[PDB]
Each structure stands twice: as C-alpha cells, then as structure tokens.
C-alpha cells in the first residue's frame, strides 16, 4: 500500500507544474492572509486596551479604526482573491489532463477505445479528472496555509510573550502524536470492518440494479428486509469505525479549547499578580493578552480546515491510481507518415508477410499474403475469430502492422492518415451514428452539400422510404435516447453516409449481419451496386450467391489460406468447401 501511494503522489506533484504560477500566488496570498490576521488582531488589541484601561474615547481612536477597517477589507479581498486563484490553478490541471487523456484516446484509436465501455472511459474523463480539482484548489493551498499562518502567530506573539507563544507551540508536537495513538486503534477497527464495509456499500446499487430479477421472482418485498438488515449492519459497523475517526478529530478540538483556556488563565492570573513567569521583564500588557487571545483560535483554524480538505487527497490519488496507469500503458500505435496519394482512382492493395498487431502488442493476424489490383472487389470469409476484421482495421489505419502493406505501391505506414482516410470509406458491423440529427449523420463525410446530392444519397440507400415514419423527417434527433432507429434503419443511414462521397477503397464489414429481411436486401443491393465503382474488400457470413465477387479470401487463425473465383473454390475440395458444405450457421 505504501509503495504505490508514494508513487501516486509524485504523479500529482508532476501535474501541479501546470498552473505553478497560481499555486505560488495561492501560497503567497496565504502568507499575506496570515499577516492581515495578525494586523487586525494587533489593531483590535491596541484599540481595546486604550478604551478599557486608559479610557480613551472612541472619537480619539479614529486612526486605528480606519486601519482596522482597511485590514478587514483587505482580508476579505484576499479570501475572495485566494479562492479564485485556487480554482484557476485547479482547472488548468484538469483542462490539461483532460487534453492528455483525449489526445491519448484519439491517437490510440478505435482499436483501444473498444476495449472498455464508453461509460468506463467517460468516468475517466468526467468523474476522475474532476476528482483532482479539490486537491489543487483546496487541499494544496491549505497545506501551505496550515504551515505558514500558524507559524506567523507564534512568531508574532513571541516578541510580546514567550509563554503565550509556547501554549500555542506546545500543542504543535502534541496533536500529531495523539492523532497517531488513536490511529493505531483506528486501524484495528478499520481493518476488521474493511471487508464488510466495502461489501455493504455496493449493496443498495446491487439490489437497485437487477431489480428486474427481484420482480420476476416476486422477491421485491423480501428484499426490503435485506436493505433494512444491510443498512443496520452498515450503520453499526461504520459507527464503531467513526467512534475512532471523530476521536482523532477531537484531538485538535481538545487542544484548540485547551489553548484558549490556558491563554485565558495564564494571562488572567498574570494580570492579577500570579503567574509572573513567561513574559520578558519590561512588563505585562492587556493588548498583549488580547492579541494572544484573538490569535489562539486562529492558530488552529488552518489545521481545522485542513481536516475537512483532507478527503480531497484520497479522491485525488484514487483518481491518480487509474489516471497514472492510463498514461503509463505502452499502447504501441500505427506509425504516421507524410506521403499522400494524389490520384483518386481505385487503389491496388498487396501485402507481403503482413502481421497485424494489437495496441497492447499481441498479434491479431498472422502472415497474410494477398494482392488486390485496382477496381477489383474481394470478399473475406472465415470462422469467427479468424482475423477478418483485424485486416479491415489495418487497411483503415486503426492497427499497427510489422510486415508490408502497400497502397498503390506506397507503404501504408508511410501514408499520411488525414489524406489516406479521404480515399477510404466503409460500413461497419454496427451502425454508429455520432452526429446530432439524421441529416447530420448522412452528411458527416461532407457537411457542405446541397439538397440535390443529399436527396440522392437518401434515395440511393432507401433512407427516404422510412422518413415518413420518423417524426421530424430527415432532421430528427436520432439515438437510443431519442427517435430510436431499428438496426435495419440505422444501417441504411450508415450506408447512405458511406456512399455520399466517391472513394478509392470501400471496406464493407459484414453490413447485412443483423438486419431484417427488407433492410438486408436494401442495404445489400445498394452496396452491391456500390462495390463496383472502386476496389472493395468485404467480409461476410452469407457466402451463398457470392459468385460475382472476383476473388474470395478464406482466413484461418489469421492467414489467407485459399483464394480465387467462387466457381473454382466451390467445386474444388478445400477449406472453402468446409465453410460452405458444412452449412451449420450456428447463428
């Protein structure tokens, strides 16, 4: 435990260099804040002595009032100023970590993003980067107010009285000692109840989630007593933990009120002839007692606020626990290049000893050898898990390959991604519509298109035949949270978006996989008349009526084992016969 937590804190300190100018103004204003606390305590003590001891009227103390008001006004400005600089320090770190997380996720690409659910990433970017704010905004500026301010009170009281400065300084080594004695007892209760408490925290969300299962078994009424008897256990276990947690806090409030009690008694008796010790021989002064009394509660306030801001350290290292591992993963990714393809003609694809490698480093496809001349459409057939879609991710630029993969004779890894993708267009297995409306998704390839060629895209893909079904027509905000489109309807939009622009290579990936009968024959017909206009690489399961496709590749564990026209593979015995004749079709 202590090994990692030391490594995480150095990560937080590394990020604090971003906005180090404002973490210094917060530290500088914290010193100035502790000066105005002393100035007003001195001004009040000198005002109060004049009007209490020598009975000077309030109308003769106009100068100390004027300076006392100004100190109070300055104090309020610094507190207002210090909060804003603390937030500014906090948000630069969050704004810059979020850019490093989003830059890392964009460069890693869809190959790595698909490893975790979109809500698992959205917790990293929203919840766990916003958890680091109160470490840099509150806790770090307070850990510097807790060491500067309390020393200013001691340094400002020592000239007037060395015992008053010793009452406050005598509890400086007592609080950490006593806070650790209760820590030994707390670790006994914390560790005994650690397994059960973490076991009972996720209880209510576990009954709330999967409330369907309680419904279908008629156990919704008997699980009220499970929530009742898991909240009695949670309360009793956590109160025995909290009897020691509030005792550690109470140490500060014990010495907070003992330090105001001793100052009151020592000064109170010093004015009565008793307790002559503790003060330099010049004499005892009422204003030297007011100054110490006003400043005694303010000695512990920086150390009391720090108690409330300490939770911000735990939730910033837990945030750093999962943010450090995110930024430390090797994540080898495809090499970017500068060369680009001038011609918009269909490309020639040939691969020699091509190996596709996962972002973590393992190989997803083995030694692939294939050649696809310009204008020729190939089709990928194989068993599930054979590396069919890994070849389509490599051609897309989403995966890193160690072998050779050439586009028009130019190596793919030496081809600039931002220009290669302008010659690339495919339809995936699942319709992913990331634009706001239905028209924004279709025009996602070229948003500055007129209605003529927008209306052509919809009719060519039969997106316009279900438009009357939709409420707002072509401008309907689409999604699972608004105007759900069936998988057949959303796949026709993904086809319409892919065919909007002419391309060089079309990497259709199992488009008619999960569709109803009508949309399957509307998607496939549109993509059968679209695969001709440029070199096309399709992967599919329905290998019947696949004769018109020129060359058929069969994949096995990551190798293209058989190739050629459908007629030559169908009649001849081989792995394609195994796929076709053994028409199990498990799904």
């Amino acid at each position: 435990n202590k090994s990692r937590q030391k490594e995480l804190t150095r990560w937080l300190k590394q990020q604090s260099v971003i906005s180090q100018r404002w973490l210094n103004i917060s530290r500088l204003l914290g010193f100035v804040s502790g000066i105005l606390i002393i100035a007003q305590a001195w001004f009040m003590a000198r005002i109060l002595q004049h009007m209490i001891m020598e009975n000077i009227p309030r109308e003769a103390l106009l100068l100390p009032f004027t300076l006392l008001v100004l100190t109070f006004v300055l104090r309020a400005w610094v507190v207002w100023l210090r909060e804003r600089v603390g937030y500014h320090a906090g948000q630069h770190i969050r704004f810059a970590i979020r850019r490093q997380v989003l830059d890392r996720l964009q460069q890693a690409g869809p190959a790595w993003i698909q490893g975790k659910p979109a809500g698992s990433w959205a917790t990293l970017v929203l919840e766990q980067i916003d958890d680091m704010h109160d470490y840099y905004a509150r806790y770090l500026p307070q850990m510097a107010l807790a060491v500067s301010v309390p020393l200013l009170i001691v340094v400002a009281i020592f000239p007037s009285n060395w015992a008053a400065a010793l009452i406050l300084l005598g509890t400086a080594p007592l609080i950490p000692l006593f806070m650790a004695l209760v820590g030994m007892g707390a670790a006994d209760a914390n560790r005994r109840n650690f397994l059960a408490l973490a076991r009972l925290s996720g209880h209510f969300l576990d009954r709330l989630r999967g409330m369907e299962t309680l419904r279908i078994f008629g156990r919704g009424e008997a699980e009220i007593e499970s929530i009742r008897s898991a909240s009695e256990d949670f309360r009793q276990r956590t109160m025995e933990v909290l009897r020691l947690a509030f005792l550690s806090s109470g140490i500060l409030e014990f010495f907070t009120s003992l330090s105001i009690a001793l100052v009151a008694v020592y000064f109170g008796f010093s004015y009565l002839g008793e307790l002559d010790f503790g003060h330099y021989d010049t004499g005892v002064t009422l204003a030297a007692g007011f100054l110490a009394l006003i400043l005694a509660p303010e000695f512990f306030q920086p150390l009391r606020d720090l108690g409330t801001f300490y939770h911000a350290k735990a939730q910033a290292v837990g945030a750093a626990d999962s943010l450090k591992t995110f930024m430390e993963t090797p994540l080898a990714h495809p090499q970017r290049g500068e060369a680009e393809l001038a011609s918009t003609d269909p490309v020639t694809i040939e691969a020699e000893e091509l190996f596709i490698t996962s972002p973590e480093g393992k190989t997803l496809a083995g030694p692939l050898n294939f050649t696809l001349p310009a204008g020729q459409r190939a089709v990928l057939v194989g068993r599930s898990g054979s590396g069919k879609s890994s070849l389509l991710n490599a051609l897309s630029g989403f995966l890193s390959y160690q072998g050779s993969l050439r586009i028009n004779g130019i190596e793919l890894r030496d081809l600039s991604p931002e220009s290669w993708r302008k010659h690339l267009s495919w339809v995936g297995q699942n319709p992913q519509l990331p634009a706001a409306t239905l028209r924004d998704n279709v025009l996602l390839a070229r948003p500055d298109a007129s209605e003529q060629e927008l209306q052509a895209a919809l009719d060519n893909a039969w997106v316009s035949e279900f438009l009357p079904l939709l409420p707002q027509g072509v401008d309907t905000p689409v999604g699972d949270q608004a105007a759900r489109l069936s998988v057949g309807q959303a796949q026709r939009v993904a086809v319409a978006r892919a065919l909007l622009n002419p391309c060089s290579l079309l990497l259709l990936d199992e488009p008619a996989a999960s569709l109803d009968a009508h949309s399957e024959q509307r998607v496939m017909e549109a993509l059968n008349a679209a695969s001709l206009r440029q070199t096309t690489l399709m992967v599919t399961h329905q290998l019947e009526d696949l004769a018109d496709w020129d060359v058929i590749w069969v994949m096995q564990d990551g190798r293209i084992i058989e190739q050629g026209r459908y007629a030559e593979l169908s009649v001849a015995g081989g792995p394609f016969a195994t796929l076709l004749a053994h028409r199990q079709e498990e799904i």
Binding site: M44, L48, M51, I52, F72, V79, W80, E83, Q91, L105, I113, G119, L126, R199, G202, H203, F204, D206, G210, T213, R215, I216, G218, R219, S226, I227, R228, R235, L242, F246, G250, E253, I260, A264, G268, G273, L286, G289, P297, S396, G397, E418, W426, G428, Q432, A445, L469, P471, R484, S486, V487, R497, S514, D516, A517, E544, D545, R583, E585, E586
Partner: protein, 572 residues
C-alpha cells in the same frame, strides 16, 4: 422547496435523534462562543482590577467557567458528530427503502426511457445527496438560528441596543444571505448540470463513433465542439466559484461590520455606565466568536441547491404511474398453463415505430416452442408482455384461456418462471442467489440442483457460503447462465420463459445447457427465445420473428420443407 416535502416525511421518523444532534450542535457552538466571550471578559476584568485586589477579585468562578466551557465544546463536538451521523445513517435506511419501494412497481417500465447504466448510479447519488440535507442544510441553519437567539437574549441583559444590533445583523445574514445566493446561483446550477450531461453525451458519441469519425474526417470537427462544450462547462464551474468566493468574502465583511460596531457602539456605554471597561470585550469578543455559527451557513446555499435538484430528480422518477395494474382477486396458480396470444401490438413509450406489429401465437400446455430472430426483432419485448412489464396496446394475452391481466401479481410470479437475457449476479452468498428462486428450500435442496446443472465446482471451499458477487468471487459467463437455470428449476412454475439461454457459449456448454433444458423442463411449458440454431429439433414448434412479426411458424422439419427465411438461416 415543495419537492423537498416528500422526503421531510422520512425525517419525521427518527425526529428525536435528529433533534438531539441539533441540540448538541448548539451546546457545542454556545460553548465555543462562550469560551471566547468569557475569556475576553476575564482578561479585561483581571487587567482592570490589576495586581491590587488579588483576593478581592473572584477569579475562581471564571476559571471554572473557562474550564467547563472548554470541556463541553471538546466533548460536545464529539457527540454532535456521533448523533448527527448516526441519525443520518438511520434516515439513509428509510430513504433507501422508500426509493426502492417506489421503484419496484415500475422497475422495467418507468426506467426504460433512461440509460439504465447511468440512471441508477445517479439515483444512488441522489439518495446520498438527500440524506445529507440534515447535516449540510438543516443542522447548520437551524443550529445557527437558535444560537443567534440565545446570544441575542443573552446579551440583552447587559444592553438592549447592542444585542439587538448584533443579533439583528447576525439574523439578517442568516435569513437574507442564503436566499440571495441560492437565487443568484440558481441559473448556473441549472447550466452546470445541463452542460455536464451534454459533454458526457458528446464525449460518449465521440469515443463510440471514433472509427466512423476518423474515416469521414469529422473527428476534429466533433472534438472542437466537444472542447467548446467543456469551455462552456468550465465557465459555468467558474461562476460557482465566484459565488463561493463572494459568499466567503461577504461573510467576512459582515463579521467585520459586527466587530467595528461593537467596538464603536459599545465604547459609548454598555447600558448605563459611560465607561463599560471589561464589558466592551465581552461584546467585541462575542461578535468575534459568534460568526462561526454562520460559517456552516455560508455554504448551505450551494448544498440546498443540490439537495433540491436531487429531490426533484428522484421525485419525478418515482412519482410516475406504473404501466401495468395488478388486480387483487387472489387467484390460484394452475398446475399446467397454456399460452395464447391474439394480435398483440405494443409501441414503446415515446416512440413512433411499432415494436410488435402483431403476434398470433398458441402454446399448449407441456409444449416446447422456440422463437428465432435477429438483433432487435422484438423477441425479448414479447417476453416482457408475458411477465407484464408492459401492456399491449392492441391484443389479448391468455393463460389457460383466462386473461393474463386478471392474475394478481403474487400469482403471476408463481406461474411464470423466466431466465433473463442478462443474468444478474446478486452480491449475496451463493445460497442467497438461489434462495430468491425458492425461499423455503433447504441447503441440501439447493445443493442437488446446483450439482445437477453442472455447477458442482461451486460446492467446494465453503462453496454454498462463498460470497459470490460484487466484492467477492465473480462467476464466468458460462457459469452465470447455469445459475439462471438453477433458479428457474428451483422456482417451479408451469411456464418457463427463456431469453437467449445459450448466448455467447461454446458448443460444448451450449449442448450441456440445451440437453439440460429438454430433460429437466420436459413436463413444463417452455417458450425459449433463441438467436442460435443449435438443438431446435426437440421443440414442438419453431416460430421465426422478423421486425416484430411472425413471418414463419411450424415444426422444424416442416419449416425446412417450404422455402423461406428459416431455410435462409442455415443456407445463406
């Protein structure tokens, strides 16, 4: 504030504990104010008396006063934090039970218009934010009011005008400042939660559509508008720190006005005597120490706004009406049930496309039917009409030629046995994960079913007592499915509904489950909803679904005889 009323009813239970926790927050907070007020007077009285009159001055009485006042704020704060948190934890149990009980009658229907992954994480946070209305909003605001009072009456004996202008200033800020800051930040808090969920909506669609955005050259156009939302979002966050900074600075210019006033005003005589002497300190130091009562108050405007949002957000989720209405006729559960459907239609709420166009389906008793379809055809929507998650708008559903809507819920749950598509593994022990199927079963009764379905590996190393859930042993996907069947077997019901029982399984365990379902459920009617084609020969009829319709129907051999969609399933 009217939406905060349903949960204040929950607070009425355990009012004693909540009242005692507030009372200890006043005794502690009066001891804090009294320690400094008495110390300031003791220092002033000792200094005025001087060395002369050592025995004349009654220093023992304040000395025991400053000792008692110091102890009762160290100990009072200890028990204030215990009773407040203990009372909060009891209300949390009532809030969790109230929220759960108001969500069961609409568990699959009222929660289907949200994204259930992030909805229930928000519900749990909404209950936790409601549970802290007492600690963050009620205990300070109510504890500050009755300290401003005791101080006001307490100081009214020495001088009325000073106590009324210190208590008056303190009362004004207590009653006027939280409302003016809750009003000032009301728009921002609405903007903050709207821009937060917009950034989550734009980020999730940026990550999910990253393959499509990158190819179509929109990954940077859609990141710019994602980063412009964050700029808008961070601006809303910045304006909340301009109300946290302003309220923290204003409360310091008010605690400064009440010290300048008790210096100027209490130096013109406290009561009768023009030269009060020690009395000036007792008023300046009271005004100095009395504004720690309002220190919790300066943040209670931010916490009240959050609790109100949670109160509204929880309420409009649980204040909507259940889709289905279960009668109370108290019928008896049949021994064998036959399923009949006639033209069942159902459009999901807030949708314009029919999920179930029309379903005609006859399932006699002791008959094994299979439903085939691709993704999103509507088959798992059909199973939720049979368990009465929704009500078909047009169509009639029959059990033994008696309408399914005429069965009381306690009888319907004993007629229908269902294994869901998404098997839920409860956190509780392995025995408790099975005892929800049948509470009255014995440990040996649980064991025989557990080892019969192939889950004998769960019967070792305190197997029947292993935690087996979140924060414990996690079952594999194949083992989890066998657990669902183990509940359907224990919960003996005439009709058994299956929802992709063999999804995502290798043929080895797919065969084991399929052969387990045909032999155990031989005498019980089965309506299995399948996305695969393996082992469908043992079913008396196979019903192929397509886009909410029954396109084909008939026995397995009959379906192959006539060319159709089922033929296209095997041969592409």
């Amino acid at each position: 504030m009217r939406a905060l009323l349903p949960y204040l009813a929950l607070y009425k239970r355990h009012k004693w504990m909540l009242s005692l926790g507030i009372v200890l927050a006043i005794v502690t907070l009066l001891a804090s104010i009294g320690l400094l007020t008495l110390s300031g007077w003791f220092l002033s009285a000792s200094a005025v008396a001087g060395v002369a009159g050592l025995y004349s001055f009654n220093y023992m009485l304040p000395a025991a006063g400053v000792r008692g006042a110091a102890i009762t704020r160290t100990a009072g704060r200890y028990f204030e934090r215990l009773v407040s948190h203990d009372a909060t934890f009891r209300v949390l149990q009532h809030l969790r039970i109230y929220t759960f009980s108001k969500l069961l009658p609409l568990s699959p229907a009222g929660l289907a218009r949200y994204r259930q992954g992030e909805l229930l994480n928000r519900v749990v946070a909404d209950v936790d934010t409601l549970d802290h209305l007492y600690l963050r909003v009620i205990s300070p605001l109510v504890g500050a009011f009755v300290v401003i009072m005791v101080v006001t009456i307490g100081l009214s004996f020495l001088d009325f005008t000073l106590a009324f202008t210190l208590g008056g200033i303190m009362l004004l800020t207590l009653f006027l400042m939280p409302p003016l800051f809750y009003r000032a930040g009301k728009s921002t808090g609405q903007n903050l939660t709207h821009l937060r969920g917009q950034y989550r909506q734009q980020l999730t669609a940026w990550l999910q559509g990253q393959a499509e955005l990158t190819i179509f050259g929109a990954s940077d156009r859609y990141r710019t508008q994602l980063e412009n939302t964050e700029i808008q979002w961070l601006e809303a966050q910045r304006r909340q720190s301009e109300l946290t900074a302003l309220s923290q600075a204003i409360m310091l210019l008010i605690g400064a006005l009440a010290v300048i006033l008790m210096l100027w005003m209490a130096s013109g005589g406290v009561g009768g005597n023009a030269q009060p002497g020690a009395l000036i300190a007792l008023f300046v130091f009271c005004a100095l120490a009395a504004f720690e009562a309002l220190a919790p108050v300066t943040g209670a405007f931010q916490h009240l706004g959050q609790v109100i949002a949670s109160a509204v957000r929880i309420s409009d989720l649980t204040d909507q009406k259940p889709e289905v209405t279960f009668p109370d006729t108290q019928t008896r559960v049949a021994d064998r049930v036959s399923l009949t459907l006639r033209d069942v239609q159902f459009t999901y709420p807030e949708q314009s496309q029919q999920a179930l166009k029309g379903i005609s389906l006859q399932v006699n008793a002791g008959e094994h039917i299979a439903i085939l379809g691709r993704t999103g055809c509507g088959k798992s929507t059909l199973l939720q009409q049979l368990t009465r998650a929704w009500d078909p708008q047009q169509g009639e559903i029959l059990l033994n030629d008696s309408p399914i809507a005429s069965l009381n819920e306690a009888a319907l749950r004993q007629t229908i046995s269902v294994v869901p598509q998404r098997v839920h593994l409860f956190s509780a022990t392995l025995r408790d994960n099975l005892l929800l199927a049948s509470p009255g079963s014995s440990d040996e009764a649980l064991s025989e079913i557990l080892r019969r379905v192939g889950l004998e590996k769960l019967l070792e190393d305190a197997g029947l007592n292993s935690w087996l859930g979140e924060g414990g042993r996690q079952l594999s996907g194949g083992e989890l499915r066998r657990l669902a069947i183990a509940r359907a077997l224990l919960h003996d019901a005439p009709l058994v509904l299956l929802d992709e029982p063999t999804e995502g399984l290798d043929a080895t365990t797919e065969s084991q489950i399929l052969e387990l379902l045909a032999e155990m459920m031989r005498e019980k009617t089965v309506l299995m909803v399948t996305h695969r084609l393996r082992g469908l020969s043992r079913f008396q009829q196979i019903i192929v679904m397509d886009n909410g319709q029954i396109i084909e129907q008939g026995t397995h051999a009959e379906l192959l005889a006539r060319q159709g969609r089922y033929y296209q399933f095997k041969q592409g």
